[PDB]
Ligand binder design. Structure first.
Ligand SMILES: OC[C@@H]1O[C@@H](OC[C@@H]2O[C@@H](OC[C@@H]3O[C@@H](O)[C@H](O)[C@H]3O)[C@H](O)[C@H]2O)[C@H](O)[C@H]1O
Ligand SMILES: [Cl-]
Length: 443
């Protein structure tokens, strides 16, 4: 039976290096795994005895002083062409975008990382990094980086949280710093203190798009955190959602803070809070899944979503989760309903599809409501009945083409492992053109 070993790394940023996977998150926390199922905790908090950066309060003194904090926010580590590992570290006071971002470099992934210096600040009283007065309604909070190479080998860094939005900078592949003269870089979306943070870019060679992953809402249990995605032919945009809305249009209304209403229409929503648990049956369930990264395995063509999540009834406790991603016929990813356990897409037979399913509809909102199941039946005659009606068909090996309440969804059928009930399950995971995700789990 599949074996899991859990770790707690908030805001996990995945990096594969020579056969081992690492996540680096906030609070200088980290963990590693060879199989994406059994993780080993390496570090958990900022202290002078954290081995990633010995004597961290001295090493990054300037950052802690600027940000007026004793911790660090969501890191990224990326290996550059020199073979070294570059940690983009950052800190924020937490009540305002009083923040600094810098880079430290290590010869080895587990450290020690040596400070090269701060290269961005936000929350100053005067002139900002772009030469104009700092204004949090339009300028970023300089936190939550993802430094990545595009398909052509050019180095970029996307970043941002709330404040003025999400930005992208061209980076120097020799030094790891931004190329000079860019200010905060190019704006991709956001503004007016929208609850959008934690950008992450993954190229998919098969669909020929860059996917920008984002977290909407707040991270806490009542915050409505959810994982969203948009895409572009270019790493620096313009990004669009499944309806063709430009992500650049996304922002809170002028003069407001945390205007969730205005932003919820934008982006494909892959996953929010849900539970498969009902009165007479245990099930998996997450609260506020988010701040993700993602990985594409060149060797197999498979993709994975890595994130932290809270859980129904566990308050603010969080753990790392990994779900496999599959691209649908329209070039959008759908997440496996259950965490990764070594499953792969296989031929699925119609005989194994028919039956009763628990259904989760993630919708398009930012909501603290934990989405619950309804029951539907996929019938032999290709109709769907029960608490919802529609139709289903299978294309090719495992492609799911499902209509529910007059909306057409596309995705996959996949037999998985349910780690709570400890049994195999037939699932589907599908997406419509409005970016609404539906998961089915067979009874
Ligand atoms: O997920 C981490 C999130 O960061 C926290 O927000 C931090 C920043 O606060 C908002 O700005 C507040 C304003 O700054 C000051 O000028 C003045 O006091 C406030 O008007 C920004 O939108 C954020 O970047 C969140 O608490 C947390 O969820
Ligand atoms: Cl789980």
């Amino acid at each position: 039976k599949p074996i899991f070993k859990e770790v707690s790394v908030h805001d996990p940023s995945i990096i594969e290096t020579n056969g081992t996977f690492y996540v680096f998150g906030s609070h200088l926390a980290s963990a590693k795994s060879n199989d994406l199922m059994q993780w080993q905790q390496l570090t958990t908090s900022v202290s002078n005895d954290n081995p990633l950066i010995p004597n961290v309060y001295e090493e990054l003194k300037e950052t802690f002083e600027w940000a007026q904090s004793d911790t660090l926010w969501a890191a990224d580590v990326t290996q550059l062409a020199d073979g070294k590992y570059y940690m983009y570290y950052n800190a924020c006071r937490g009540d305002s975008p009083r923040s600094a971002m810098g880079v430290a470099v290590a010869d080895n992934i587990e450290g020690p990382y040596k400070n090269k210096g701060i290269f961005l600040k936000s929350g100053m009283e005067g002139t900002s990094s772009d030469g104009t007065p700092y204004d949090a309604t339009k300028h970023p909070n300089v936190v939550a980086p993802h430094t990545f190479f595009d398909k052509d080998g050019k180095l970029w860094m996307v970043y941002g949280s709330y404040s003025g939005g999400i930005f992208i900078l061209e980076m120097n592949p020799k030094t790891g710093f931004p190329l000079p003269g860019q200010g905060y870089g190019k704006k991709l979306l956001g503004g007016n203190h929208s609850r959008i943070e934690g950008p992450y870019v993954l190229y998919n060679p098969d669909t020929q798009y860059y996917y920008l992953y984002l977290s909407y809402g707040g991270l806490d249990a009542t915050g409505g955190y959810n994982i969203r995605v948009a895409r572009s032919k270019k790493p620096d945009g313009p990004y669009y959602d499944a309806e063709g809305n430009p992500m650049l249009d996304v922002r809170g209304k002028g003069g407001t803070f945390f205007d969730d209403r205005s932003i919820e229409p934008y982006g494909v929503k892959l996953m929010g809070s849900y539970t498969f648990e009902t009165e007479n049956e245990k099930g998996t369930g997450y609260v506020s899944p988010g701040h993700n990264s993602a990985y594409y395995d060149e060797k197999t063509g498979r993709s994975y979503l890595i994130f932290h999540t809270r859980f129904p009834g566990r308050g603010e406790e969080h753990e790392v989760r990994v779900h496999q991603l599959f691209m649908n016929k329209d070039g959008w990813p759908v997440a496996a309903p259950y965490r990764y356990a070594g499953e792969t897409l296989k031929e699925v037979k119609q005989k194994d599809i028919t039956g009763t399913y628990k259904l989760i509809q993630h919708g398009k909102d930012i909501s603290a409501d934990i989405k619950q199941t309804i029951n539907i039946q996929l019938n032999k005659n290709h109709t769907i009945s029960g608490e919802m009606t529609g139709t289903w068909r299978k294309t090719g090996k495992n492609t799911a083409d499902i209509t529910l309440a007059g909306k057409k969804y596309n995705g996959v059928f996949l037999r998985q492992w349910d780690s709570v009930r400890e049994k195999n399950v037939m699932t589907f995971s599908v997406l419509n053109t409005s970016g609404e995700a539906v998961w089915g789990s067979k009874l």
